[PDB]
Amino acid sequence: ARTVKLLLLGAGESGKSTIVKQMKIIHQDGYSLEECLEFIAIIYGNTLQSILAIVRAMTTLNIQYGDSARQDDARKLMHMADTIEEGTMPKEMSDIIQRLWKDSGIQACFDRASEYQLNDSAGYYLSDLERLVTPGYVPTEQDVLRSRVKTTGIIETQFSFKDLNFRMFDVGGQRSERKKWIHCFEGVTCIIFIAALSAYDMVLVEDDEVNRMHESLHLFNSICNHRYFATTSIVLFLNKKDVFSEKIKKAHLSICFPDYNGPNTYEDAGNYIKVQFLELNMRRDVKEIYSHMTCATDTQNVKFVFDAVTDIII
Numbered sequence: 001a002r003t004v005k006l007l008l009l010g011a012g013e014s015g016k017s018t019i020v021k022q023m024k025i026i027h028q029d030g031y032s033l034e035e036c037l038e039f040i041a042i043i044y045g046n047t048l049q050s051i052l053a054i055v056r057a058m059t060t061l062n063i064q065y066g067d068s069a070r071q072d073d074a075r076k077l078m079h080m081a082d083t084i085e086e087g088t089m090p091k092e093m094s095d096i097i098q099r100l101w102k103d104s105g106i107q108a109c110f111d112r113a114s115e116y117q118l119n120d121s122a123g124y125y126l127s128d129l130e131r132l133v134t135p136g137y138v139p140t141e142q143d144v145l146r147s148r149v150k151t152t153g154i155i156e157t158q159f160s161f162k163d164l165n166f167r168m169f170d171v172g173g174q175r176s177e178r179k180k181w182i183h184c185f186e187g188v189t190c191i192i193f194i195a196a197l198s199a200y201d202m203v204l205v206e207d208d209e210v211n212r213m214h215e216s217l218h219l220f221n222s223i224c225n226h227r228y229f230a231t232t233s234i235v236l237f238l239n240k241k242d243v244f245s246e247k248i249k250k251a252h253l254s255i256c257f258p259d260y261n262g263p264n265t266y267e268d269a270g271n272y273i274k275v276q277f278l279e280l281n282m283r284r285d286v287k288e289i290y291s292h293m294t295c296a297t298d299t300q301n302v303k304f305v306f307d308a309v310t311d312i313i314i
C-alpha cells in the first residue's frame, strides 16, 4: 500500500499529542487496562500542578480566599507538594484540594486562568477529583486524552486507513524538539498545522509582550511559505473550539487583533482567526489550504476531521 508521512506541527499546548492519542483510539485499539493504569501518576501530577498554579495566582493576582480558613490549607498543600512521592495523591492532599476548589476566591482566580496560563485540563480533573481518588479508579480514555506528559523521545504513530499506511509524527518548534528536525521534514506527504483558537488572549510565560496566537501565526507563516513545502498538502486545525466558545463570551478578540471590529461571536470571531492564518499563504491562489474547527478531545470530531484530511491526501 502507499505510505503517507504526516507531520503534526504547532506551538506548545496546541493539541498535537491529543490528536496522536486520538489516532490510537480511532485507528489502533485504544488503551488496555495496564496502559490506563499508567496514566494514574500522570493525572495526579497534572492535577497537583493545576491547583498549585491557581493557589500561587491568588498571590500574584492578589485575590483573597472566600474563607480565610483556606489559607492554612494552601500552606499545607504547598508543603505536602514538596514532601509526597511524585505522582501520588494521598487522602490528606486530595481532601485539601477539594476544599480549595470549592472556595469562591479560588474560583474567581480559576476564572482568570488566561492571566497565568493555566493548562486547559485543570477544571476537568479538579471538578472530578473524587472519582480520580476512589480506590479502584482506572483512567477512562477521556481522562487519558486530557493528560499531559513530557515525552522526550521520538514517537511514530503508524496505522493503516483507507488503504494508506500512515507514519505520523508530532513535532514542536521549541529547542527541546531539535532531535526531530534531523529527519522529520524529509519526504512529508501532509502537514497538519494545529493552532489553539483559545490562545488569542494569552501571552508567553517569559515574554508578557508576546501573544501566543501571534507566535502560532508567526510559525505558520514560516512553514506555509517555506520552499520545502511548496507542494506539500497542508491542513489547518483550529483547535480547542470548545474552550474558545466559552472564552469568546468574556474576552474580546481585539485583545489579540486590534483591527478586529466584529461582534465577538463564536462563528464570526472563529472565521476571522481562520482568515488571519490562511491569508499568510503566499502560494494561496495556486496552493489551497483547508481548515477545520476542531476539539481534539472529542473523538467523534477528530474522527470526522481526520477522515476529511485523508480524502484530501488521496
Ligand SMILES: Nc1nc2c(ncn2[C@@H]2O[C@H](COP(=O)(O)OP(=O)(O)O)[C@@H](O)[C@H]2O)c(=O)[nH]1
Pocket: 010, 011, 012, 013, 014, 015, 016, 017, 018, 019, 119, 120, 121, 145, 146, 147, 148, 239, 240, 241, 242, 243, 294, 295, 296, 297, 298
Ligand atoms: N478542552 C480542550 N482541551 C484540549 C483540546 N486539545 C487539547 N487539549 C488539552 O490541552 C493540553 C495541551 O495539549 P497537547 O496535545 O498536550 O499539546 P501539544 O503540546 O501540542 O502536544 C492537554 O491537556 C490536552 O488534553 C481541545 O480541543 N479542547
Ligand SMILES: [Mg+2]
Pocket: 016, 017, 018, 170
Ligand atoms: Mg505534545
